[PDB]
Nucleic acid binder design. Sequence first.
RNA 1: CAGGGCCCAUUCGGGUCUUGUAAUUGGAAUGAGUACAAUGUAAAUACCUUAACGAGGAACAAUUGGAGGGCAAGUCUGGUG
RNA 2: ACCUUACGAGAAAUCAAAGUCUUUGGGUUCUGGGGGGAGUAUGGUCGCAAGGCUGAAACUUAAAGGAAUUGACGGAAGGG
Lengths: 58, 60, 184, 216, 144
Amino acid sequence: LNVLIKDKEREERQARLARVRGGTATGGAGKKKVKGKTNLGGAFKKDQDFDLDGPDDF
Amino acid sequence: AKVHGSLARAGKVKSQTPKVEKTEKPKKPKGRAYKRLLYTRRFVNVTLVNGKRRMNPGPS
Amino acid sequence: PRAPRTYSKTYSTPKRPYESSRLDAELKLAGEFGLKNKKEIYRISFQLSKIRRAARDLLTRDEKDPKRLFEGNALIRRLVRVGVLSEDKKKLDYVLALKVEDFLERRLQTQVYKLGLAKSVHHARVLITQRHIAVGKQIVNIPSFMVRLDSEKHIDFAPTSPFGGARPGRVARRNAARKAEASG
Amino acid sequence: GWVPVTKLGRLVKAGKITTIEEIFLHSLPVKEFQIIDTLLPGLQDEVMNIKPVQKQTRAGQRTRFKAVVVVGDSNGHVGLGIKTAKEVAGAIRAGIIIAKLSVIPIRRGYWGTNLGQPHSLATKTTGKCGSVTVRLIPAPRGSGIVASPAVKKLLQLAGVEDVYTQSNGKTRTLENTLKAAFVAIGNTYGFLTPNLWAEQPLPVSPLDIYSDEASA
Amino acid sequence: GKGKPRGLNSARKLRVHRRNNRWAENNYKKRLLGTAFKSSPFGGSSHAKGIVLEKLGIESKQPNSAIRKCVRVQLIKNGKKVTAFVPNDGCLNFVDENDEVLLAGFGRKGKAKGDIPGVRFKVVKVSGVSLLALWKEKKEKPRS
RNA sequence: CAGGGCCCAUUCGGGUCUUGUAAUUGGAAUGAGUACAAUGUAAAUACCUUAACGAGGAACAAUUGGAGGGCAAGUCUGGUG
RNA sequence: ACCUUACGAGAAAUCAAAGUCUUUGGGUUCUGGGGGGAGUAUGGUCGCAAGGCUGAAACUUAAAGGAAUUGACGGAAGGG
Ligand SMILES: [Mg+2]
Ligand SMILES: [Mg+2]
Ligand SMILES: [Mg+2]
Ligand SMILES: [Mg+2]
Ligand SMILES: [Mg+2]
Ligand SMILES: [Mg+2]
Ligand SMILES: [Mg+2]
Ligand SMILES: [Mg+2]
Ligand SMILES: [Mg+2]
C-alpha cells in the first residue's frame, strides 16, 4: 500500500508541474530551482581509482 | 559470548518487502530453438554495440 | 547372478566452467550445426580425444611395427569410411590434425541440409525426428547418425510418409474433411 | 612524418632493409618503433592487465597504473612491454611502443617426422623471472596450447600451435610469469642442435654495405 | 647428494622415511587416527537428525553487526549437543521447539564458516519438510 | 518494420541479392497421449508396427542456480538502513 | 680470513659457495610441512633434586612470517 501511495504522489506531481512552465511550482518567483541527477555510471561506488580510463571522447 | 539477542526481529525485511506481482510474458522456446535465438542475438544480429559487446546493458 | 552389463559414459565436461572464448566457440558450433545443448559438442570432443589418444600411442611406436600397421590402417580405414578423413590425407598424422567440425559435417542433420531436402539445419532436425527420412530403405530419426559416404547417395524421403507420398497426414486430412463437409 | 635518427632507421626508411631477419641475424639494436611496425605491419596487440601501484607521500598515496602489453604477428615474432604511467591510456600507448621495441624470433619445429609446416617448438626450453619458472615442451599435432590463459595468448601470438607447459613458483604474479615465458620462447633460437652444427660464411653487415645512406 | 639416499638397495629407508613424514600431514593423520569416527559429533556421517533444545541469538564477529539466529540441538544417535545455524531470512519461525531437524555441515570441512562464531552445522529440514520449500512457500509444515 | 554496391549514372526514389524484430495473417508436419488389431509373452504389461482420435499461444507453458571479484552475465528500478 | 667481479645462484639481503639445481640423479646421515593450543597434557625413561630426552589431541584461526621499498615518527646522529 505504501508503494501505491508513493507512485500516486509521483504521478500527481507530474500533473501539477505540467501547467507551470519552468521547474518548480511558482516558477521564477519561487527562489527555488529544480535539481538534477548525477549520472555517475558505476564509477564511484565503494570509491576507488579507475582501471578503465577512456581513450577517446565522443 | 552474547549468545542471547533480539530474536523478535527475525524476518523483518522479508515481511517489509512490497509485493510486486510478476508480469506475464510470452513463453521462451526450449531446447535447440533457445540456442538458436541466443546464437541469433549474439552473432548475426549484433544490433546493440558500444564497440565492445555487452549482454545486459543498463540504460546509458 | 548374471553377467553385468557394460556401459560407458560418452562425453566429458571441460575443466574451467566459465571461460568466454570457449563459450563463444561452442555457441558458434551449436548455431551453425543446429544442436540443442553443449553435451553434443562434448560428445564429439570426447570421441576425437579417444581417436587422438590411439593415434598418439601408435606414433610413439616405430614404423614397420606390426601393431602400428594393423591398428593404424584400421583407424584410418574407419575414418575415411565415415567421411571424417579425406581420401588423400591417409597417413595417421592428419588423424591428429582433425577437429570437431570434421565430425559435425557428417551428421544426418547437416547432410540432409547439404543435400537440400531441408532448407535449414533446424528444418533438417525436425524432418529427421518426425520420421520423414530414410538413409537406405530404413527410416532413421536420429540426427547424429554419421553417414558412411556410400550411404550419402541413398538419403531420401521415407516411403511411408508424406513428402515420399501415398497418404497426406493428420492436419491435411482434417482440412480436406472440412472442405468435403462444406461441399456436403 | 618520421624523420628517423639511427643508421638502421635511415636504412629501413630507404628500403635497403626489407625484412627483420637481417636485424635478428646481425643483432642490430632497434631503438625506433617505426622500424618494427614498418618491417612487420601485420602484428596485432593485446593489453593483459592494468594494476595500480602506489607510492606513499606526506598526505596519502601517489598512484600510477602499470600496463602489460603483448604484441605479435601469428608466425614467429612477439614482444613484451610493461609501462607505469599517471594515465591508463598513456600506459597502454607506451606499452605498445615498448612491446614493439622488444620483438624477438621464435624457433618453431616438429614433434616428429617433419611432414607439414612446423607446428611445435624444436626443444624443451625454460625461462625464469622472479620465483616463476616456465617450461615449454614440444607437443603432438592437435594438442593445442596447454597453458594458463595469459601465457596461452602469448604463445598464440607467437605462432605456436601446440605445446605442453609446466610452471613453478608464484605463478599468480602475472608480470613475472609473462617475462619468464618470454625468456623461455626467446631461448628457442639459443639452443644449438645437430641441424645447426654446419658452419656458415658469416655474412657482412648491412651497416657496411649501405654505410653512405647514414647521416653523413 | 640432495639429502635422501640414492643407492639401488636403499628402498627400505625411503619407505620408512615416507611413512614417518606422511604423519606430518593433516588429512592423512586425521584419516589414519580416525578422529572423525571418535571425536566428531556426526561420527563421520554427512547428515544427522536432532532435537531442538533452544533458540540462540549468537552475534557475529568483527567487523559485522548482526544476530545470527542459530539453535541448540541434541543429536539422536549420540545424545551430543550441537549448535546449528538456521539459514535464510525469517526461517527461525519454523524451527520453534522439540523438532526433528536434519543438519549438514557448512562446507568448511569442520570449520566455523563465516562471521558466525563457533557453529559448524546448518539446518536442512525441519519436521520432514525442507527449509527452502518452507521459505519459498512450496510446502508448509505439519502442526507438530 | 531496422540494412550494401549497383539497374539506374533520373539530388533523400523501387530497392532486387539478403539478415533480424511484428497486440499481422496462413496452411502444412509430428509425436507425448488415447486406442481396434496383430506382434510380443508360459500368460500378460511394455517396446517395435499400426486403423481411429490427438496442436499451437490465458494451449501439450523446463527447470536449477546465479549476475562485485575469483568466474559467464546489470553505467537498472522499488524496499531495509 | 679478507678484497674485487658475477661465470652463476637467489625472494631479496646477499653468496667462491648459499655455484656446477625443470638442460632437475657423486655418496651418506638428520630435521621440516600455515599460525596457535604447546614443548603443553599423558605414558615411558634418566636424575638426590632442579629437571633432561621422547611427545599428542580436542578445539581454534585467515593469516602468522621473510627480505626489501616509500612515508611517518624517534627522550638517535649530522647539515641548512
Ligand atoms: Mg606447480
Ligand atoms: Mg648399489
Ligand atoms: Mg590446523
Ligand atoms: Mg575478516
Ligand atoms: Mg531462477
Ligand atoms: Mg541471491
Ligand atoms: Mg538480484
Ligand atoms: Mg565477469
Ligand atoms: Mg621486516
